[PDB]
RNA sequence: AAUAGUGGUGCUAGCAUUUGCUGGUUAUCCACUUCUUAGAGGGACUAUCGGUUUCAAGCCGAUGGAAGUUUGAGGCAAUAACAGGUCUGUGAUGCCCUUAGACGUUCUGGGCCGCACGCGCGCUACACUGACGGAGCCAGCGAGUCUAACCUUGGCCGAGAGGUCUUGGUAAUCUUGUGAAACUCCGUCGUGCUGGGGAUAGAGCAUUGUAAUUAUUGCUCUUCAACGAGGAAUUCCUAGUAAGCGCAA
C-alpha cells in the first residue's frame, strides 16, 4: 500500500510499475544497465523457489548480495549463503517493500564505552 | 504618510488551532509562529489572501481567520504546485499534504517506530540511530 | 602506475607526464625545468 | 490607541531642537516603522527644516 | 607567389634571434614584402612542490619554470625563393613551420 | 541640445521609465510570480509584490544599450548577491533563467531588442528611434 | 603589430536637432604606435647642499628625483650522534614462510567513518558600522578535445537542479571584458537572544558510475534546538604591511 493501493499486489503488478511506486534512485536505477552476470542469482532464485510448505529457504549463491533491490518474489525466505567473511544472514520479512537487499548483514557491532571515561579528549594539559 | 488612530480592538490572544498570536506584528509573522510553516511557506498564502502585508492583529476581518485555514486546509485547491509542500508522496496513501502546528507530531512517530521496531519497508540498519544513539 | 621510488600516490597528472613526485625531483633538470625564485 | 499618537507629537513636535528616529523612540510602544512613519508624516505638514538625508539616515531640523 | 606565414616557438632566447635575423636577411637581399617579427606574450610552466621524501620535517615548498617563447612572421614571395631558404635555417632545440592560409 | 541615454540618472531613469511601463501593462506577466523568486542563492520573493516585473523588465533594456550583443548567460552572471550555504564559506550567485528566458522574449512583442547575425539579442532602429525617445521622455523629468 | 589598439575616409542607425553628441561593422580603405606585448639599450651612486663624530667609517635632516627601509621580494651556498635518506637503490642479507607462495590477482563486505569532555591552524556567530529586498557594476595568474570526450557561450524546456539542439576553441584569437565578492545608493525592518544564528533532523526531484544504505554530493518545503564577546593561559602573519573580501590551478 505505497499509494494507496492494495497491498496484496505480489504477483498481479510486474517489475515495470514497481518502480513507478517507488523513490527516485530507482527510478534511475531501472535502466541503469541491462545486467547478465549480476543477473545470476535471479536465474538461481528460481532455481529453488516456492517448491515448499509454509514459511522457505532460498538458493542463495555468493555474490558481491550487498547491492540488489528487493523483489516482490520473496516470502520468508532465508537469504544469503557464504560469499566473504561477514556474514550475511537475511531471511524475509513478511512484504515490507522497495528497498535494497544490503540493509541486514553485520557491519559494525554496536558496543559502547569499554573503557571511554575520557570521552572524547582531555582537556588542555598541566601537571 | 498620516495618523490613523482605531479604538484598540486587538487580542493579545488568537485561537487559529490552539495558536494563541502576538498580533502586533506583520501577518506574515504572525502565522510563522505556527509550526510546520515558515516564512518560505507563509509568504505567498498571504498574498493570496490578498490583503495589506503590513497589519497587526487590531485591524482584520473576521472572516479571514476563517479564510487563511480555508486557503491552508486545500493546499491544491488554488494553486500550489507540488515542489511548495511538506508532505509529498507518502508510503501510506501516496497523496500529499500540508502539515499544521499541533500534528507534525502526527506523521511523526508511527512513521519512525516502523523504522525503529518492525524493521520496515526501509528500515532495517536505519534501525538503531533513533534507538541507541539519538533516542 | 607505480613508477619507482615507492610511490603510487602523490602523481603529477598535469602536462601530461605522469611522474611519481618522488623521482620528479632528480628528473626535473633534463626535462628542463629549472628553478629561479 | 488613539491618543498616544495624538497629542505627543501632533501639538509637541516643536519643543525640541533637532528631530532624529532618537527621541520617537522614548516611549517603548512608538516602534521602529511607527517612529519612521512620524518623519514621513511630519515632513508633508512641513514643520521640517531638512538639512541631509539618506537611506540610513535623515539630518532634520524643526521649523 | 602566395603570401605565407611561418611561426617559431623555441625555449633558448639566445638561438632565436640569430634565426629571426637571417630570416629577415635573405628575404631582403630579394626584397619581398613582408611584416615584421610580432613577439607574443611568453608562456610560463609551473609545479609547487614540497622539498621531502618523506614527510617528517618543516613545511615551506619549491617552485619550479619553465619559459616558451613565441614569434612569427608573415610573408609573401614566389615558392622557389621560400622553399630553399627555409632548409638552411637549421638549429637544434629550434622549431620552424610555414603557413600558407589564404582565405 | 540633444541627448543620447547617457547622460541621465542611473537608478532613477529605471523608476520614472518603469512607472511609464506600470502605466502600460502590456506585458506577459506569467501565473508563478507570486512564488518564484530571482534566483536560488536569495531568500524571499522580493518586497515589491508587482513593480519588480517591471523593473527587471526595464534594466535589461538599459543594459543591452552601450553592449553589442546579450544571450542568456551574460545576465544570470549579473544580478547583485551571494550566495550563503549556511556554516560554509560563501560562493557567487548565478541567477535563474526561466524568469528571463521569457521576459527576453517579452520585448520582441513591441518591436525593442532582436536577434543580431552574430548570436545575441540586440536592439534595431525599433528601439533606436523610440527607446531613445521615450528615454528622450525622460528629460521632462529633468526639471 | 587583423592572434594588440586608438585616428580618419566611408556604406550606416539614432539624431535636440540645424553645425551636433552617441552608435555602425569585415575587409570601407588609408594613416598611426601614446596606452599593449617583447627584443636592444639607458637610468641611482645615497647624488647635491646643512648639521654631527678621533672630522675617520658612518648616521641624521634637507630640496630634486619613477625610485633614496641592502630601492621592494625571493633563489643560491655544509659543521654536525634523529641508523625516517632505500625502487626494477643493492644493502653494493642467509629466515622476512623469503620457492598447498600468506608477497599475486580477479571475485568478495569490513581501513582513516561509532557514547558524555580536546591542547582540533581560522572556519559560521554572538548584530543596526546589521540583515532582507530592489538597483548601480568593477580583476588578476593560471587551464583546456583525436584515438577522444576537455572547455563551454545563443536557441531551446523547466522553479531551481538540470535536460535537449548547436557551435567556438590546439590557442593573446574561442569560452572570457572570466560582468568575483566585500563595498555602493533606494527601501523594508526595530532591538526582544525577534525577521540576528541555522547547528540535529523527516517528507521529496536530480544528476556520476559496476555500484551511493552508514545520509558520495546538489536544489525543494518544513523544523529553528547550543550560542549575549569568552577563566587560568597563549599567537604560521611587517607599510599597499596587519586585517577583512576572493573563488583561479
Known sequence: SYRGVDLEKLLEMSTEDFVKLAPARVRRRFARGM????????????????????????????????????????????????????????????????????????????????????????????? | ???????????????????????????????TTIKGVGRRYSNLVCKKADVDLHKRAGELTQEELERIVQIMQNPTHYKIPAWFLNRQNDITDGKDYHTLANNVESKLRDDLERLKKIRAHRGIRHFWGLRVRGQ | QCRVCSSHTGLIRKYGLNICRQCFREKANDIGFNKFR | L??????????????????????????????????????????????????SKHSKQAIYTRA | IIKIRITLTSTKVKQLENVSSNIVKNAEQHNLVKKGPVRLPTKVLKISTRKTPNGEGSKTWETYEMRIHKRYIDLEAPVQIVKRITQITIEPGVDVEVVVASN | ???????????????????????????????????????????????????????????????????????????????????????????????????????????????????????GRRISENGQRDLDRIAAQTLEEDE
Do not use: C
Open chain 1, 35 to 127: 545486467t547478465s552476470k549480476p543477473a545470476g542469482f535471479m536465474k538461481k532464485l528460481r532455481a529453488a523457489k516456492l517448491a515448499a510448505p509454509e514459511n522457505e529457504k532460498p538458493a542463495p549463491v555468493r555474490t558481491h548480495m550487498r547491492n540488489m533491490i528487493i523483489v516482490p518474489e520473496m516470502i520468508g525466505s532465508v537469504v544469503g549463503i557464504y560469499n566473504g567473511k561477514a556474514f550475511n544472514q537475511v531471511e524475509i520479512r513478511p512484504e515490507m517493500l522497495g528497498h535494497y537487499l544490503g540493509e541486514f548483514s553485520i557491519t559494525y557491532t554496536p558496543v559502547r564505552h569499554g573503557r571511554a571515561g575520557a570521552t572524547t579528549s582531555r582537556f588542555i594539559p598541566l601537571k
Open chain 2, 1 to 31: 504618510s498620516l495618523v490613523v488612530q482605531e479604538q484598540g480592538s486587538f487580542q493579545h490572544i488568537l485561537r487559529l488551532l490552539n495558536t494563541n498570536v502576538d498580533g502586533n506584528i506583520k501577518i506574515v509573522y504572525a502565522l
Open chain 4, 2 to 51: 488613539d491618543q498616544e499618537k495624538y497629542d505627543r507629537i501632533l501639538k509637541e513636535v516643536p519643543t525640541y531642537r533637532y528631530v532624529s528616529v532618537s527621541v520617537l523612540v522614548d516611549r517603548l510602544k512608538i516602534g521602529g516603522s511607527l517612529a519612521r512613519i512620524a518623519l514621513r508624516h511630519l515632513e508633508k505638514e512641513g514643520i521640517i527644516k531638512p538639512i
Open chain 6, 1 to 119: 541640445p540633444g541627448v543620447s541615454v547617457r547622460d541621465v540618472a542611473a537608478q532613477d531613469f529605471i523608476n520614472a521609465y518603469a512607472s511609464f511601463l506600470q502605466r502600460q501593462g502590456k506585458l506577459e506577466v506569467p501565473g508563478y510570480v507570486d512564488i518564484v523568486k530571482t534566483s536560488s542563492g536569495n531568500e524571499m520573493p522580493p518586497q515589491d509584490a508587482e513593480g519588480w516585473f517591471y523593473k527587471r523588465a526595464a534594466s535589461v533594456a538599459r543594459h543591452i544599450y552601450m553592449r553589442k550583443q546579450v544571450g542568456v548567460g551574460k545576465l544570470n552572471k549579473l544580478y547583485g548577491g551571494a550566495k550563503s550555504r549556511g556554516v560554509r564559506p560563501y560562493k557567487h550567485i548565478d541567477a535563474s533563467g526561466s524568469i528571463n528566458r521569457k521576459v527576453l522574449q517579452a520585448l520582441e512583442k513591441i518591436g525593442i531588442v532582436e536577434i543580431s547575425p552574430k548570436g
